[PDB]
mmCIF file of C-alpha atoms and ligand atoms in Angstrom:
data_model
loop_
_atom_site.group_PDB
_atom_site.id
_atom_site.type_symbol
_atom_site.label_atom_id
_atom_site.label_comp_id
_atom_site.label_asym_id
_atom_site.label_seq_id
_atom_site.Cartn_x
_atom_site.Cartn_y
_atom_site.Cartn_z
ATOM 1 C CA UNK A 1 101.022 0.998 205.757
ATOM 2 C CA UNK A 2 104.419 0.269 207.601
ATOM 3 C CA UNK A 3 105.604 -3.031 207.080
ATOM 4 C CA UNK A 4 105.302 -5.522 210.062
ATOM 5 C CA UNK A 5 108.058 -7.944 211.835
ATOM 6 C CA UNK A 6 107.337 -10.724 209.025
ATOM 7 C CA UNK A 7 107.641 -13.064 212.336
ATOM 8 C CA UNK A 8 103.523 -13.259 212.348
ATOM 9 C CA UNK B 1 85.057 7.788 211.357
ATOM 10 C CA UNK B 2 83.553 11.167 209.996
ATOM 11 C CA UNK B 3 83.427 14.230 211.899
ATOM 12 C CA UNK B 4 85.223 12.772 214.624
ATOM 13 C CA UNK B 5 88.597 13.857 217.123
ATOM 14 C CA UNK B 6 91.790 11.641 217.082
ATOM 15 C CA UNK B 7 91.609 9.652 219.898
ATOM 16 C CA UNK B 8 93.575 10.133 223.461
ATOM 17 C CA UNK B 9 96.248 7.406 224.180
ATOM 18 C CA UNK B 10 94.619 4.398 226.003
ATOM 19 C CA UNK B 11 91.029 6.042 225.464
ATOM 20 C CA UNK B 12 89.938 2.760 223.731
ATOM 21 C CA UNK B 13 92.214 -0.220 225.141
ATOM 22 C CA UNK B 14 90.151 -2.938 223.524
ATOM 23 C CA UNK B 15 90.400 -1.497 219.771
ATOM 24 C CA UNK B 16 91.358 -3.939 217.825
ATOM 25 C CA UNK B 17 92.593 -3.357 214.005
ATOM 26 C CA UNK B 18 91.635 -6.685 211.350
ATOM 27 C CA UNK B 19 94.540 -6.116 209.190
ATOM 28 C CA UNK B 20 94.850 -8.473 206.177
ATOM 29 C CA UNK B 21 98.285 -10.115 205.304
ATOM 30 C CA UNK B 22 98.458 -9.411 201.739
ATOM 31 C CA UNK B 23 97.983 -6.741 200.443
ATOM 32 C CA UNK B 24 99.386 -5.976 204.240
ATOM 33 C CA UNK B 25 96.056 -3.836 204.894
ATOM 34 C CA UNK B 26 93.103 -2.659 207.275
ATOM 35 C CA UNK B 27 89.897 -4.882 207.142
ATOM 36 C CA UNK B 28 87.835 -3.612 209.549
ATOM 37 C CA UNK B 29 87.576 -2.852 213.813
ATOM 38 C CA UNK B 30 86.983 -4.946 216.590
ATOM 39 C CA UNK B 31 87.007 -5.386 220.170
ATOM 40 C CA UNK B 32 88.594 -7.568 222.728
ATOM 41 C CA UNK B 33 86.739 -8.888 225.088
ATOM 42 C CA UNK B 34 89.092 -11.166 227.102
ATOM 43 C CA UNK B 35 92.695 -12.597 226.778
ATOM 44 C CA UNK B 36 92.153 -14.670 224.145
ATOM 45 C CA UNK B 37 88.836 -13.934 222.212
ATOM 46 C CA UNK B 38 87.798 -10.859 219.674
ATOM 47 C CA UNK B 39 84.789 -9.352 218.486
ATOM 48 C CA UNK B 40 83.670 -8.291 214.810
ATOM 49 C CA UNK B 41 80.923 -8.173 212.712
ATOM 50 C CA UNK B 42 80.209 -11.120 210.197
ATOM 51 C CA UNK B 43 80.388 -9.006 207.210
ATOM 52 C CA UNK B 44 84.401 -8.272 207.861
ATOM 53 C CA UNK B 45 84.857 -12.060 207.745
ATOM 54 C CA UNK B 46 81.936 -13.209 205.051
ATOM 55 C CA UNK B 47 80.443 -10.866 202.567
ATOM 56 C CA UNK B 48 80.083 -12.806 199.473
ATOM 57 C CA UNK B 49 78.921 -9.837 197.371
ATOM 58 C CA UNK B 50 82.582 -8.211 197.371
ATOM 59 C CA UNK B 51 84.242 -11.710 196.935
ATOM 60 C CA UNK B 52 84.875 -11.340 201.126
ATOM 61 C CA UNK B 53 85.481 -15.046 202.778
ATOM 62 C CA UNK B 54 88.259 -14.851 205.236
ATOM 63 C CA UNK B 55 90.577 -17.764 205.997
ATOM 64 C CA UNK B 56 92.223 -17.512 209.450
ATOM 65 C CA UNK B 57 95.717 -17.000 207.974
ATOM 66 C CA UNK B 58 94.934 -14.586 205.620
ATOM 67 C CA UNK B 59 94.290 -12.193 208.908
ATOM 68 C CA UNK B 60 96.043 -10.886 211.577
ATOM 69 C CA UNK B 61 94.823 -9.378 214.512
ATOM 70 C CA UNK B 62 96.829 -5.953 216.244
ATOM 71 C CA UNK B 63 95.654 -4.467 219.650
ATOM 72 C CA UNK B 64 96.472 -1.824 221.230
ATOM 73 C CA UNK B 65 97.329 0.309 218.470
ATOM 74 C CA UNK B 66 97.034 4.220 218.062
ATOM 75 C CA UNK B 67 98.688 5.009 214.759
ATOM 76 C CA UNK B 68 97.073 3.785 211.673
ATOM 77 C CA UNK B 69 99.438 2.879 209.378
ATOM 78 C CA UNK B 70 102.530 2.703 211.644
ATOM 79 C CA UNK B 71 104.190 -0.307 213.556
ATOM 80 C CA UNK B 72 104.090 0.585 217.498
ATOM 81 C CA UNK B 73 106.930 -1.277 218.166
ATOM 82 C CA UNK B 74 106.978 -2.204 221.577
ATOM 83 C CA UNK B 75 103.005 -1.052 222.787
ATOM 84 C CA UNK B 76 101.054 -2.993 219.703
ATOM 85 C CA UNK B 77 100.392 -6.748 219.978
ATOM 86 C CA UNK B 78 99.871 -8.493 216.919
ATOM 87 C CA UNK B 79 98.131 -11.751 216.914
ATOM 88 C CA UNK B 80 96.870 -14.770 215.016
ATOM 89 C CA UNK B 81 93.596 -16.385 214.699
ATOM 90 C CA UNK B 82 93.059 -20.121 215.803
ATOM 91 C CA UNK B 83 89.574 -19.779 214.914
ATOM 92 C CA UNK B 84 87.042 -17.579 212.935
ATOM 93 C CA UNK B 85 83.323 -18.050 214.171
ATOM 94 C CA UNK B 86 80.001 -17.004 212.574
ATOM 95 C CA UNK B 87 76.793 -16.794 213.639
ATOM 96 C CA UNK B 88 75.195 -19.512 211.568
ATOM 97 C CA UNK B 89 72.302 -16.989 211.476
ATOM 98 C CA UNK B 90 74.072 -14.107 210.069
ATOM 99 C CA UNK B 91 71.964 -12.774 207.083
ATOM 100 C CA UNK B 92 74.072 -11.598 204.498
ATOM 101 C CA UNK B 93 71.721 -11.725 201.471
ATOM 102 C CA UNK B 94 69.520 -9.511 202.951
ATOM 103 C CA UNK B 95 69.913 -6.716 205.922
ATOM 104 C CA UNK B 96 72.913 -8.297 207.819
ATOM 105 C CA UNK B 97 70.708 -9.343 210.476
ATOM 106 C CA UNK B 98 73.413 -11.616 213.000
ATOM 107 C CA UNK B 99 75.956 -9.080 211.933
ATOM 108 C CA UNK B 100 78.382 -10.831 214.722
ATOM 109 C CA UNK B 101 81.570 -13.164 214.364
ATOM 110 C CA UNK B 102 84.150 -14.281 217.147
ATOM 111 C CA UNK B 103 88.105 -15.076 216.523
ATOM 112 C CA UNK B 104 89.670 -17.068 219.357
ATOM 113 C CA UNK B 105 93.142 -16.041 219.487
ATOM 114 C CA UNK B 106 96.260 -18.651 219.115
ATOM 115 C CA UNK B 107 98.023 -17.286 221.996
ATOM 116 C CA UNK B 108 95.823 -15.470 225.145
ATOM 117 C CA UNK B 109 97.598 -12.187 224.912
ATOM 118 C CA UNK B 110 98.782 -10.012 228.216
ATOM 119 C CA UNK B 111 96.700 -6.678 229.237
ATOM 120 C CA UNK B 112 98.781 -3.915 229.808
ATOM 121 C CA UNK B 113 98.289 0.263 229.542
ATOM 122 C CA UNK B 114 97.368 0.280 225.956
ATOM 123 C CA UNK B 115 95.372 -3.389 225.817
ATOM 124 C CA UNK B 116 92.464 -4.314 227.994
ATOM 125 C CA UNK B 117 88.883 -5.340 227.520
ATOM 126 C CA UNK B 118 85.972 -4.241 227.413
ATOM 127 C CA UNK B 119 82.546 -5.205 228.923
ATOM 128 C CA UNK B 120 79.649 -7.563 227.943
ATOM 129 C CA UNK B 121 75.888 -5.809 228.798
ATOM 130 C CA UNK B 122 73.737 -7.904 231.045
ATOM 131 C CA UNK B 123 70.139 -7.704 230.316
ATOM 132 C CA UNK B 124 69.683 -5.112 233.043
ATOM 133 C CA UNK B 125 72.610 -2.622 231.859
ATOM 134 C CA UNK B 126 71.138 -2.837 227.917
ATOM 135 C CA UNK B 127 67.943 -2.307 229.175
ATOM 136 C CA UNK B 128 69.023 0.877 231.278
ATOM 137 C CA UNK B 129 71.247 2.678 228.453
ATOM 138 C CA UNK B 130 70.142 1.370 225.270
ATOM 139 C CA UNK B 131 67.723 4.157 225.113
ATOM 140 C CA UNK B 132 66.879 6.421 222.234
ATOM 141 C CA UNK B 133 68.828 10.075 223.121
ATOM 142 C CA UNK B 134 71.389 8.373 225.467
ATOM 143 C CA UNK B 135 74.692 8.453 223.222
ATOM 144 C CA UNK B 136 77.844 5.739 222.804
ATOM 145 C CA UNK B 137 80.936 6.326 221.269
ATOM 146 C CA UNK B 138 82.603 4.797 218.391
ATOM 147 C CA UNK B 139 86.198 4.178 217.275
ATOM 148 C CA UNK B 140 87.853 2.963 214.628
ATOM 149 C CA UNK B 141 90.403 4.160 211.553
ATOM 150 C CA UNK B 142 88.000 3.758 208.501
ATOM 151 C CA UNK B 143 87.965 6.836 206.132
ATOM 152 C CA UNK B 144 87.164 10.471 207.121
ATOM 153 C CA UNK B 145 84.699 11.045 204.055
ATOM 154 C CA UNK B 146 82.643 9.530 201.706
ATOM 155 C CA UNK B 147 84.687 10.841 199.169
ATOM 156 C CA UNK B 148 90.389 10.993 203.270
ATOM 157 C CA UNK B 149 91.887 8.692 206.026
ATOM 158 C CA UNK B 150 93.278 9.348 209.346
ATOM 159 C CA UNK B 151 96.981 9.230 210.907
ATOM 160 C CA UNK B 152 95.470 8.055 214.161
ATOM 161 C CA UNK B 153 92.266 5.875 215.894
ATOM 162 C CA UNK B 154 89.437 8.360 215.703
ATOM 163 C CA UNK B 155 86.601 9.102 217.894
ATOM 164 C CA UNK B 156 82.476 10.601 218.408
ATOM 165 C CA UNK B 157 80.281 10.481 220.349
ATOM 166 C CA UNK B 158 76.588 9.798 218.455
ATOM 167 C CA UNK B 159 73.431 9.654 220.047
ATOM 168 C CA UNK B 160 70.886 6.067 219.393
ATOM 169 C CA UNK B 161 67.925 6.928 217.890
ATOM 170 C CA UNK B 162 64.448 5.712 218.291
ATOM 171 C CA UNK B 163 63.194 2.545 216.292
ATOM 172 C CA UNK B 164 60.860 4.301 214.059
ATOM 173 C CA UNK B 165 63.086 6.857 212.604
ATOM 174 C CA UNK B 166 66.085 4.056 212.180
ATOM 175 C CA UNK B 167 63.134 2.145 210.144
ATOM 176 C CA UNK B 168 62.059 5.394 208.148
ATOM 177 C CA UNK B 169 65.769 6.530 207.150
ATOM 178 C CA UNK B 170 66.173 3.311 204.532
ATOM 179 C CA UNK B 171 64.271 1.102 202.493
ATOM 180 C CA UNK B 172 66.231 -1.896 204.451
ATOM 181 C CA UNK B 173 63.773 -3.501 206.746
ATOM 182 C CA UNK B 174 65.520 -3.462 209.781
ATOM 183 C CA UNK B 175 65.498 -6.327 212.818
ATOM 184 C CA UNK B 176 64.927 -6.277 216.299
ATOM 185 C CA UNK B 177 69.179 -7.514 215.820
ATOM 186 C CA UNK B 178 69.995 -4.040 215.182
ATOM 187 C CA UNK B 179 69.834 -0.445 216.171
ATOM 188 C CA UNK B 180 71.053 2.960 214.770
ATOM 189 C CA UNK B 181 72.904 6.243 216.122
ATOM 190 C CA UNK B 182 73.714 9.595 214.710
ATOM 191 C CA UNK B 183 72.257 13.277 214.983
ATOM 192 C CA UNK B 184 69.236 13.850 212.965
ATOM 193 C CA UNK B 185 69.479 16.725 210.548
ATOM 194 C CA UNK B 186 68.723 19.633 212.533
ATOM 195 C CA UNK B 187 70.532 18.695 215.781
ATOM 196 C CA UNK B 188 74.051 21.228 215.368
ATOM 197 C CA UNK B 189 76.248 18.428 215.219
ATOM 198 C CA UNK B 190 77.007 15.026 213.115
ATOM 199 C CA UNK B 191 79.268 12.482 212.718
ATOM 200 C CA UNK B 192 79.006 8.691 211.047
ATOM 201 C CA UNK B 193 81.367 5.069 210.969
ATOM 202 C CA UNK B 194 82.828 5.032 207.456
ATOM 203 C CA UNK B 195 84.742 2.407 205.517
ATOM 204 C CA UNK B 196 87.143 0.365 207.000
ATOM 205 C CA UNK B 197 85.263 1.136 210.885
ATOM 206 C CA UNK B 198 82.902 -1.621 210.338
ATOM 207 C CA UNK B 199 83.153 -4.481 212.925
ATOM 208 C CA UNK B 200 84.871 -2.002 215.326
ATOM 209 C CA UNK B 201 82.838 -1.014 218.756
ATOM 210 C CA UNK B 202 80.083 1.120 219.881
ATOM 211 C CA UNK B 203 80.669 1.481 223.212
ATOM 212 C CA UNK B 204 78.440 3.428 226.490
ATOM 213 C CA UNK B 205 80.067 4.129 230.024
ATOM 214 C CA UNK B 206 77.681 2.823 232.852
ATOM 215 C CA UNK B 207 76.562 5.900 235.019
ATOM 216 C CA UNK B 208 76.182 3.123 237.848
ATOM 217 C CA UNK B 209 79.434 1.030 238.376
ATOM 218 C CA UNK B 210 81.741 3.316 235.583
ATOM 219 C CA UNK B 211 82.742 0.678 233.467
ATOM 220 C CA UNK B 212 82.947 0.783 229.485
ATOM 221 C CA UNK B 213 79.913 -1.898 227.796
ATOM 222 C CA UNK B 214 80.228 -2.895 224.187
ATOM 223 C CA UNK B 215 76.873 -2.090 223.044
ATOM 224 C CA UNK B 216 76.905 -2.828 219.632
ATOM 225 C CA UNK B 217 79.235 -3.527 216.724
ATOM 226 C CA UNK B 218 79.315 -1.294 214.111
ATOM 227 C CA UNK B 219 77.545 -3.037 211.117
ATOM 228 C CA UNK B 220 76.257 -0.916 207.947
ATOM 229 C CA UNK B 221 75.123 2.561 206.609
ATOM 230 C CA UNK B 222 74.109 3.974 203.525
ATOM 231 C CA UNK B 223 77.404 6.589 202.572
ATOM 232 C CA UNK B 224 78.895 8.592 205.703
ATOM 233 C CA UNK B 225 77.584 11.079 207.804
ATOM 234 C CA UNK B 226 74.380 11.555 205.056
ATOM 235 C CA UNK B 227 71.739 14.111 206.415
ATOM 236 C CA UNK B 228 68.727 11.631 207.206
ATOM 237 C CA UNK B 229 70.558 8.688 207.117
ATOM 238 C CA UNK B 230 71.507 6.644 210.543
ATOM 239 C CA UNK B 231 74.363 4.202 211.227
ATOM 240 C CA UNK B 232 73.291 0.204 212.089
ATOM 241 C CA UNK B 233 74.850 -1.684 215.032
ATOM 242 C CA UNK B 234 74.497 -5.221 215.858
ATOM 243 C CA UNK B 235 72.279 -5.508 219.064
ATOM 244 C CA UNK B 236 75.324 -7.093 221.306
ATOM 245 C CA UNK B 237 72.673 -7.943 224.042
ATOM 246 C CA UNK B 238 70.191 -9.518 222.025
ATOM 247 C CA UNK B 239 73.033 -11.613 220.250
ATOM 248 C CA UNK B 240 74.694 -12.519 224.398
ATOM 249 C CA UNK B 241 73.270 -16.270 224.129
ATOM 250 C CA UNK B 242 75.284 -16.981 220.951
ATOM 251 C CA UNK B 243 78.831 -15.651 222.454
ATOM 252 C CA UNK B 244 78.386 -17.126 226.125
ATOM 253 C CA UNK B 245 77.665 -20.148 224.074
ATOM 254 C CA UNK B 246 80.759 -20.613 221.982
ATOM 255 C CA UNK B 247 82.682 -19.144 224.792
ATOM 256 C CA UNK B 248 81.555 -21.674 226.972
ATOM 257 C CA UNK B 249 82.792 -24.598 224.215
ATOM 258 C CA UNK B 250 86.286 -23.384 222.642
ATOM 259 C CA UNK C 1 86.445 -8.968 235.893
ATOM 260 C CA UNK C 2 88.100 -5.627 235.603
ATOM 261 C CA UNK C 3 86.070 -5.104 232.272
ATOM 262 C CA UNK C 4 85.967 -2.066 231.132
ATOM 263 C CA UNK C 5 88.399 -0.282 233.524
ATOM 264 C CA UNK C 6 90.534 1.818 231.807
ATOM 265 C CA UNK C 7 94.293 1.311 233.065
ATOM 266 C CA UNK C 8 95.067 5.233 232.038
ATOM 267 C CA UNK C 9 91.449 6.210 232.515
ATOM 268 C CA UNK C 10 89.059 5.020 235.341
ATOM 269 C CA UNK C 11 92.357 2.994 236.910
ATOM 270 C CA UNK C 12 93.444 6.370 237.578
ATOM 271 C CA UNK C 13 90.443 8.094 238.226
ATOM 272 C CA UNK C 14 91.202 10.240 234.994
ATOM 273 C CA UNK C 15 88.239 11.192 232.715
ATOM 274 C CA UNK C 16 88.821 11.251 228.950
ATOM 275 C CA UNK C 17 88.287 14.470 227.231
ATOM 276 C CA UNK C 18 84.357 13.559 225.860
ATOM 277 C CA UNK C 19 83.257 10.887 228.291
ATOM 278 C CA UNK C 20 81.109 13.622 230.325
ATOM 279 C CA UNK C 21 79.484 13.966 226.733
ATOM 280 C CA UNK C 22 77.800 10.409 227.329
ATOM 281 C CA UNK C 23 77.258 10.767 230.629
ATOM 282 C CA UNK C 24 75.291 14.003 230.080
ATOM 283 C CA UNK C 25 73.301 12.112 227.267
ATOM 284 C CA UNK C 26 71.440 10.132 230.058
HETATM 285 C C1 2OJ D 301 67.485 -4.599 201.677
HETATM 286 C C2 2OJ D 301 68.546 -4.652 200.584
HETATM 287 O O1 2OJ D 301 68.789 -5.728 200.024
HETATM 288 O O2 2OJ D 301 69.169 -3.432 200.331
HETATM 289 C C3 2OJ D 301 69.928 -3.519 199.146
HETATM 290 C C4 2OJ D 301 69.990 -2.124 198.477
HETATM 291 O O3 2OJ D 301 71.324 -1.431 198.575
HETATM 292 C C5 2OJ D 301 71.469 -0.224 197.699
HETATM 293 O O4 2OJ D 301 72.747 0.509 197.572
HETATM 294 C C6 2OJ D 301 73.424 0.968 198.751
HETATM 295 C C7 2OJ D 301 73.361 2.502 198.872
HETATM 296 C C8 2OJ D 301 74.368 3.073 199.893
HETATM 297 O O5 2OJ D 301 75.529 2.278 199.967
HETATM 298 C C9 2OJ D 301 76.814 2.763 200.152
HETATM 299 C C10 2OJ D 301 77.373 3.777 199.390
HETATM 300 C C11 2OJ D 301 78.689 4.168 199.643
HETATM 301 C C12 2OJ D 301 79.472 3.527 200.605
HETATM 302 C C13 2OJ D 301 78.950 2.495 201.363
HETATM 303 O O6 2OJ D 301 79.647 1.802 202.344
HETATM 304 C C14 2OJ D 301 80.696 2.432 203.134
HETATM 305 C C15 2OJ D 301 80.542 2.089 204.645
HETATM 306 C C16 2OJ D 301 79.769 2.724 205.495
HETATM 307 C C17 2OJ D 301 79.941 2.106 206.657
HETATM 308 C C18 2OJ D 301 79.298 2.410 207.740
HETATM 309 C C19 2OJ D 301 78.687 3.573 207.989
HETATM 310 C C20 2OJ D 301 78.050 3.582 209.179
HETATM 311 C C21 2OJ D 301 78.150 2.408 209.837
HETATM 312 CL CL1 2OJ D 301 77.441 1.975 211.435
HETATM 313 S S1 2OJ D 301 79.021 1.369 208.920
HETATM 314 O O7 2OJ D 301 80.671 1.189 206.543
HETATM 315 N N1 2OJ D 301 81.107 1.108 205.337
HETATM 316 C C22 2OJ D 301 77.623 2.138 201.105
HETATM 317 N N2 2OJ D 301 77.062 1.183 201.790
HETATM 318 C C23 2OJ D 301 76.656 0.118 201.138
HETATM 319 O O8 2OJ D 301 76.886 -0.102 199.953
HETATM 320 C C24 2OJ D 301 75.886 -0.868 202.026
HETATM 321 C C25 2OJ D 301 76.058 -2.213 201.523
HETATM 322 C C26 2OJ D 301 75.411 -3.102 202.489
HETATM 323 N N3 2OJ D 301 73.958 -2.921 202.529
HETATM 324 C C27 2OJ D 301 73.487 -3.768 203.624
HETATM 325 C C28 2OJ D 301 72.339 -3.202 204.395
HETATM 326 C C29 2OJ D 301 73.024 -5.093 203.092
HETATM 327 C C30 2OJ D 301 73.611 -1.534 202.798
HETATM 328 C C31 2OJ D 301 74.427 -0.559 201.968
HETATM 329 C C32 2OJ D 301 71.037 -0.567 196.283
HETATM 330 O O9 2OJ D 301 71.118 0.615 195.412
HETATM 331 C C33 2OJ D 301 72.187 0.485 194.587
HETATM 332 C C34 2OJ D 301 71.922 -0.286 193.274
HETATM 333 O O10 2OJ D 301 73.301 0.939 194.828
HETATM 334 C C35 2OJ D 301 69.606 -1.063 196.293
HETATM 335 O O11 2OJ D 301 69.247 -1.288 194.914
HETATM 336 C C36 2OJ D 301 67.938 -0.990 194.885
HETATM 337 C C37 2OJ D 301 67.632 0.483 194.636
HETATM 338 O O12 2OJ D 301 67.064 -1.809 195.110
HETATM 339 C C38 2OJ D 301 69.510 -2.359 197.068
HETATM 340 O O13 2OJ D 301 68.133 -2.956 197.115
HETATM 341 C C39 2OJ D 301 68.143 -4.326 197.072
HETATM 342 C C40 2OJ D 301 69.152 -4.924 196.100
HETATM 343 O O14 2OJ D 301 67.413 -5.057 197.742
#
């Protein structure tokens, strides 16, 4: 799994 | 999904992916039926016998996705929960009878090509194409095999079968909460929800006004894609009461 | 309201590659 924007 | 076809951009605009924080990882499907609320089954949010009992904030919520695994920068929205509701009939030490939870987004979230929601049956569309024969489709990106998972959302198209062969595929004793779908054994094709598609949508296109109805949910099987064995769906009709309810309320 | 309207489907009038797979079904 590709890492998200850790903004959420 | 088993046996299924990757799925055409924008062929299933209110996917949604439950995708836990950490381990950063998919849940389960959904569906979004407005700007702000989502649709799962009760069993990706509570399932005591795996240790399952979901906080809000240990989930997010991403729509309009294609790709598995990938962020889709710029087409994927990714959302948090406000709140997590269950049926407070949801049977989970038995046959997952209730098999149906809402989230109410934080933030109402904006449609666009890739994100847009699907339909609620009336009483008068489930009673029209919830028929044994007539066939729904289901999406989601749970495994390809009991076993082995897919790059993309996957697709089929599975037919619901009548009552009395759902009942006589399982020792479960099913309720009038749920129904099933697949091909029976001897019917050329096949096709089954797996892991990780659970909660996602089985949907049917009305012949009448050609718009997409969330049917049912997808619930619970025994394996994937067995010969003589069915997949379960929460009833969304029967269930209607209970989300026009807390709609009407948060 | 516009429910289950596809925006690159039905919005379009463009038929996905299986829907006529359902529709057959009834
Ligand atoms: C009525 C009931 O309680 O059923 C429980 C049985 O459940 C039996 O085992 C499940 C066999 C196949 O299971 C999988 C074997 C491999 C993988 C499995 O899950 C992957 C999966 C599949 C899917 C979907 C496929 C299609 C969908 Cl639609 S969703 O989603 N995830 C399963 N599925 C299960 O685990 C579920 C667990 C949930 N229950 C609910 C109905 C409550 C159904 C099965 C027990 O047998 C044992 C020990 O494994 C059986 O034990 C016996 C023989 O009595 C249980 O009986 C009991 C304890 O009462």
């Amino acid at each position: 799994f590709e890492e998200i924007p850790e903004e959420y | 999904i088993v046996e299924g076809s990757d799925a055409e951009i924008g062929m299933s605009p209110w996917q949604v992916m439950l995708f836990r924080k950490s381990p950063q990882e998919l849940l389960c499907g959904a569906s979004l039926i407005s700007d702000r609320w989502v649709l799962t089954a009760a069993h990706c949010l509570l399932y005591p016998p795996w240790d399952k009992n979901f906080t809000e904030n240990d989930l997010l919520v991403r729509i309009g996705k294609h790709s598995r695994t990938r962020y889709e920068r710029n087409i994927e929205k990714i959302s948090m929960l406000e709140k997590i509701y269950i049926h407070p009939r949801y049977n989970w030490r038995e046959n997952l009878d209730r098999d149906i939870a809402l989230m109410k987004l934080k933030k109402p979230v904006a449609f666009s090509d890739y994100i847009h929601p699907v339909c609620l049956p009336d009483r008068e569309t489930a009673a029209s194409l919830l028929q044994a024969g007539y066939k729904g489709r289901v999406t989601g990106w749970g495994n390809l095999k009991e076993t082995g998972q897919p790059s993309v959302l996957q697709v089929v198209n599975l037919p619901i079968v009548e009552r009395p062969v759902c009942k006589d595929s399982t020792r479960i004793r099913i309720t009038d909460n749920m129904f099933c779908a697949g091909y029976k054994p001897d019917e050329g094709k096949r096709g089954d929800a797996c892991e990780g598609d659970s909660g996602g949508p089985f949907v049917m296109k009305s012949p009448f006004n050609n718009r997409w109805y969330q049917m049912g949910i997808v619930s619970w099987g025994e394996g994937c894609d067995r010969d003589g064995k069915y997949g379960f769906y929460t009833h969304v009709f029967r269930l209607k009461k209970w989300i026009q309810k807390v709609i009407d309320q948060f | 309201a516009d429910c289950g309207l596809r925006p690159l489907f039905e919005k379009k009038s463009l038929e996905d590659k299986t829907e006529r797979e359902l529709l057959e079904s009834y």
